[PDB]
């Protein structure tokens, strides 16, 4: 749209950060050393940040654009565009 | 600091201004620099002589031909319209600023003079010691 009057700043409360996040990253893992896939519950995990391939669940049950807005029951990845990986944020629950 | 300054309106209509030296104490002359100060300006209030002939009316562009006539009349001062006295709630008005230096005419309603002034001062800075 590119027509909006003002942009406001402020402080993000712990609840604001939790509402932004699509999941908690529970492990300091990036990618598998063999398959080079985004291992689950780490950084890059498709369960939260979104799929690597467009309209593809991690396990490959839903590979086509017919079904979107659904989450694979096995791999727990939502079927949508891979661009969401740019906009989707996680969070860490501190002890 | 000056990038947000642009010419918003034609005239602020205020009567305030500042004084220019314009040829002091000659002869028995003129001034070293009248082109940096008096030139390109716009007269704030009427310039009158000793007997009040009112040689040059308000708002004149104060070109070199106007300076000669002012010197012939014998007045050593003129109150000029400047951006310091300009009200113009937002930005500045074209009449207070003065003649556009590149155009040689009055300033357009769209000219952004803050960036132009910043570049005008900054560019020669390589020659200072």
């Amino acid at each position: 749209v590119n027509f909006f009057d003002e942009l406001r700043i402020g402080l993000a409360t712990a609840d604001d950060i939790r509402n932004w996040s699509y999941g908690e990253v529970k492990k300091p893992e990036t990618i598998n050393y063999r398959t080079l896939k985004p291992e689950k519950d780490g950084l890059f995990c498709e369960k939260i940040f979104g799929p690597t391939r467009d309209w593809e669940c991690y396990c490959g049950k839903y590979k086509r654009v017919r079904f979107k807005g659904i989450i694979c029951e096995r791999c727990g990845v939502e079927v949508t565009r891979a661009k969401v990986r740019r906009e989707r944020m996680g969070h860490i629950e501190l002890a | 600091v000056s990038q947000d300054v642009i010419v918003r309106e034609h005239d602020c209509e205020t009567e305030r201004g500042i004084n220019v030296t314009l040829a002091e104490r000659g002869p028995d002359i003129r001034d070293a620099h009248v082109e940096t100060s008096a030139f390109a300006r716009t007269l704030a209030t009427d310039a009158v002589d000793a007997n009040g002939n009112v040689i040059i009316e308000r708002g004149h562009d104060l070109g070199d031909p106007a300076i000669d006539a002012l010197l012939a009349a014998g007045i050593t001062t003129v109150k000029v319209r400047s951006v310091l006295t300009c009200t113009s709630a937002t930005g500045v008005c074209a009449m207070c600023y003065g003649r556009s230096m590149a155009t040689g005419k009055l300033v357009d309603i769209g000219e952004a003079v803050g960036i132009v002034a910043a570049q005008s001062i900054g560019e020669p800075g390589t020659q200072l010691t």
């Binding site: 402080l11 950060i17 990253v25 990618i31 940040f49 944020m89 501190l94 002890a95 | -």
Partner: protein, 293 residues
């Protein structure tokens, strides 16, 4: 001075609790990318390891708490978590920065915004643009004040999409694929087509550094042989461009509004006077002076 902060929290509705974090947001992956380049070797952003130090120390703290531990070990782990989050947001602001291999300080979220290399002065207040090029400048003493010599190879790549649609308009090529291959292969047909789109299509010339607005001026392109650029000798005073090997850049306006601003506002013939003192900036100088004198 202490009141300003106390009053700031009083006027707004944000609780001061926001100054302590019970949760740390995680930046999306594509903004901290991990990708491979040559033959399998990998490259990743520094945030991933700064995050790693945070998550690793946070989980080790959970393990110490469940077992139960002397306060010496737990508190030591807690301050480690405190510095790991600090190093993530701003590295080096408190004590020594977290260093990588060879004593290189890791880039932190705050380092992304700050500095000449930050998001602002680097990727925001300035950007790298398409439809542009550069080359050396040579004197164009035979040019008109509004004209500039443009290398034919440069103009071909700059106007490539235009000449493509033109030789598709004409039957010289079928569809758009043979048009692109015909431009890339230099086949002689496109030369007559380039002069057609080049006509009365202005371009912007830039000579860095740009001190004033006259450092950028619009010209009418004239297809010229060779790889150099022909510049009008009068505009040299504006660009402060010596012919000792200076390089200049060219940009191509596209939308009708852009072309109009180049013809009216930024045309070379339109600005002959310095918009500071008022003295004419483009006037006979050097050879022309002694030539007329």
């Amino acid at each position: 001075k202490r009141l300003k902060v106390v009053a700031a929290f009083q006027q707004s509705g944000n609780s001061p609790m926001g100054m302590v974090l019970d949760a740390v947001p995680v930046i999306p992956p594509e903004l901290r990318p991990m990708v491979q380049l040559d033959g399998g070797r990998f490259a990743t952003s520094d945030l991933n390891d700064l995050y790693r130090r945070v998550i690793n120390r946070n989980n080790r703290l959970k393990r110490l708490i469940d077992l139960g531990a002397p306060e010496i070990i737990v508190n030591n782990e807690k301050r480690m978590l405190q510095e790991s989050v600090d190093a993530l947001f701003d590295n080096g602001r408190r004590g020594r920065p977290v260093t990588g291999p060879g004593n290189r300080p890791l880039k932190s979220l705050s380092d992304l915004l700050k500095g000449k290399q930050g998001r602002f002065r680097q990727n925001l207040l300035g950007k790298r643009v398409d439809y542009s090029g550069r080359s050396v400048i040579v004197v164009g003493p035979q040019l008109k004040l509004h004209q500039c010599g443009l290398p034919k190879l440069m103009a071909l790549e700059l106007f490539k999409p235009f000449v493509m649609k033109r030789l598709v308009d004409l039957n010289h090529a079928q569809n758009i694929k043979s048009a692109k291959r015909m431009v890339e292969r230099q086949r002689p047909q496109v030369w007559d087509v380039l002069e057609e789109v080049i006509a009365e299509h202005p371009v912007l010339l830039n000579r860095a550094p740009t001190l004033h607005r006259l450092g950028i001026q619009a010209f009418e392109p004239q297809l010229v042989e060779g790889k150099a650029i022909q510049l009008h000798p009068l505009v040299c005073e504006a660009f402060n461009a010596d012919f000792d090997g200076d390089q200049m850049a060219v940009h191509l306006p596209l939308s009708a509004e852009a072309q109009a601003e180049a013809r009216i506002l930024m045309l070379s013939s339109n600005n002959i006077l310095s918009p500071a003192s008022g003295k004419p900036l483009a006037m006979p100088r050097l050879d022309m002076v002694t030539g007329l004198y």
